[PDB]
Amino acid sequence: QPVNHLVKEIDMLLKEYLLSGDISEAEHCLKELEVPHFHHELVYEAIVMVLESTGESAFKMILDLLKSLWKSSTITIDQMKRGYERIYNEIPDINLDVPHSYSVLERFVEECFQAGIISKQLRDLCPSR
Numbered sequence: 001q002p003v004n005h006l007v008k009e010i011d012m013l014l015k016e017y018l019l020s021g022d023i024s025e026a027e028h029c030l031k032e033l034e035v036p037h038f039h040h041e042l043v044y045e046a047i048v049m050v051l052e053s054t055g056e057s058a059f060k061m062i063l064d065l066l067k068s069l070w071k072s073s074t075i076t077i078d079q080m081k082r083g084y085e086r087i088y089n090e091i092p093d094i095n096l097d098v099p100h101s102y103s104v105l106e107r108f109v110e111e112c113f114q115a116g117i118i119s120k121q122l123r124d125l126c127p128s129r
Contacts, residue, residue, distance in 0.1 A: 009033055010045050017065060018049070018058055026065055027074065039075045043083025050108055051094055051101045059104075063111055070117040081122055084109070088127050102128040 013033070017026035030042060046062045053059065069075045087094075087105065095101040106128035113123040 006033070006035060006038060007041065007045070010038075010042050014042075014046055014049055014062075018061060021061065023061075023065055023068060027068060027072070030069070030074065036076065036079070039069075039079035040082035040086060042069075043075070043080060044086045047083070047087045047105070047108065048094065051098055051104055059108065059111075063108070063115065066112065067115050067117055080118065084118065084122055085125070088125060091127055 010033075013026060013029045016029070017023070030039075043066065046066060050059050050062045066075075070080060091101060091105055106126060109118070109123055109126045109128070112118050113120070
């Protein structure tokens with residue numbers, strides 16, 4: 001299948017962030033991509049990475065990154081909502097591939113909510129609940 005160059009760039013951005021821990025580099029590189037109508041894919045891939053990870057490091061790092069992106073007005077509310085809603089749609093299959101993803105997703109959603117970055121509606125829509 002032909003390469004989706006922007007999915008690749010988003011995945012590379014997120015992996016560079018997990019490996020370096022550099023939140024500013026991640027934010028700068030996302031802005032340089034100039035893809036504000038595809039930020040839902042950044043959210044989607046980020047959350048998939050949390051679900052596919054081990055230990056607590058990727059969870060916290062991706063939490064802090066989405067916190068900063070929201071709070072800095074880098075991601076619009078429509079793009080935030082679409083990214084989470086995409087995860088909510090695909091979680092049955094992600095959970096088959098990675099058991100207990102419903103529980104991880106739920107903890108992630110609860111922490112996002114506690115951080116002030118998603119509506120109570122969007123929280124409530126999480127299918128783990």
